């Protein structure tokens, strides 16, 4: 309620207004054509979301009351998932149109070489998300539940589960206020998201192998820290 408002407000301040959208690099028709620039663009797009998602997380009531080590672990473990979740909701998959948190708009083919096949998987997940017609308050709860979740190595796992439970209840109550089957279809997108993001890890592995350009240190640390072997 006040929780709901704070979550909505955190979501809306974490991304571009309709009027801040930048179409100046956008190409409707992409010409017949990975090189270093594609790989650089991929890392730049990921990296443009680090600070934004950290600041968003800091506005979730209770998140700053988790241990700093648990805060960092949750952000790192959820970063790719959150990047994709927010991108999927923001983008317009019926146009092949990717909308990043800076407002930058790009057509599928302008990214695809950096992203690899993963971009198609992301657009498929975005089309599925869009069909659900998730309203902003439900999305703002769900994003929080992507982040505030069990992860191996947490210092205070019960406190994480308690804040999770608060956000879950807030969502449940909101979905009842608007209208269990709707709830479960919303929650079901979280595992699909995780699985989707395995392909993200696979893509980074591939790019680190190829090594046309190395990942930036912060992305590299996320990648390394989230490999459970």
Rounded CA-CA distance 229/225 in Å is 9
* Alpha carbon of residue 181 to chain centroid: 24
- The answer to whether residues 227 and 201 touch, using CB atoms and an 8 Å cutoff, is yes
The three-state secondary structure class of 2 is: helix
Please, which contacts does 81-84 make with residues 24 or more away whose CB atoms are closer than 8 Å? 81/146, 81/193, 81/194, 81/197, 82/49, 82/53, 82/143, 82/146, 82/147, 83/46, 83/49, 83/53, 84/122, 84/125, 84/193, 84/196, 84/197, 84/200
Cα(202)–Cα(208) distance, integer angstroms = 10
Domains contained in the chain, number: 1
- Tell me how far apart the terminal alpha carbons of the chain are, to the nearest angstrom: 41
**Bridge partners of residue 106, in order along the sequence:** 98
Residue with tokens 């992305």: 219
Q: How far apart are CA 53 and CA 79, in angstroms?
A: 8
Residue 150 φ/ψ, nearest 5 degrees:
-65, 140
CA distance linking residue 123 with residue 167, whole number of Å: 27
Distances (CA, A) of 178 to 135, 158, 171, 183, 188: 10, 30, 11, 12, 19
Element (H, E) at 17: none
Residue 153 exposed, middle or buried by CB count within 10 Å (0-12, 13-18, 19+): exposed
The whole-angstrom separation of Cα 113 and Cα 211 is 15
Range of the domain at 177: 1-229
Fill in the DSSP letter of residue 104.
B
> CATH number, domain at 159?
1.10.565.10
Q: What is the DSSP letter of 92?
A: B
Cβ burial, residue 61 (10 Å; 0-12/13-18/19+): middle
Report how far apart, in Å, the C-alpha atoms of 41 and of each of 85, 110, 122, 146, 148 are: 19, 10, 17, 25, 29
Strand partners, 107: 97
Beta strand pairing status for 97-99 and 105-107? antiparallel
Helices (H), 31-156: 36-47, 50-58, 68-90, 108-115, 118-132, 136-147
Q: How far apart are CA 194 and CA 100, in angstroms?
A: 20
CA–CA separation, 106 vs 198, rounded Å?
23
Phi, psi of 49 (to 5 degrees): -95, -5
Dihedral over Cα of 94, 138, 105, 23: its sign: positive
Q: Which two tokens stand for residue 219?
A: 């992305």
């Amino acid at each position: 309620a006040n929780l709901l408002t704070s979550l909505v407000r955190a979501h809306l301040d974490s991304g571009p207004s309709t009027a801040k959208l930048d179409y100046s690099k956008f190409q409707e028709l992409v010409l017949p054509h990975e090189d270093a620039g594609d790989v650089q663009q991929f890392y730049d797009l990921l990296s443009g979301s680090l600070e934004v998602i950290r600041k968003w997380a800091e506005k979730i009531p209770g998140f700053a009351e988790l241990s700093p080590a648990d805060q960092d672990l949750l952000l790192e473990s959820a970063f790719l998932e959150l990047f994709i979740w927010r991108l999927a909701y923001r983008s317009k998959p019926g146009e092949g149109k990717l909308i990043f948190c800076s407002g930058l708009v790009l057509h599928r083919l302008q990214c695809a070489r950096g992203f690899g096949d993963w971009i198609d998987s992301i657009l498929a997940f975005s089309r599925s998300l869009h069909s659900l017609l998730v309203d902003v308050p439900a999305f703002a709860c769900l994003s929080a539940l992507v982040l505030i979740t069990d992860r191996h190595g947490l210092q205070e796992p019960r406190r994480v589960e308690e804040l999770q439970n608060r956000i879950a209840s807030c969502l449940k109550e909101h979905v009842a206020a608007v209208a269990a089957s709707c709830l479960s279809r919303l929650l079901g997108k979280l595992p699909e998201l995780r699985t989707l993001c395995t392909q993200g890890l696979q893509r980074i592995f591939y790019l680190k192998l190829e090594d046309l350009v190395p990942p930036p240190p912060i992305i590299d640390k996320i990648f390394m820290d989230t490999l459970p072997f």
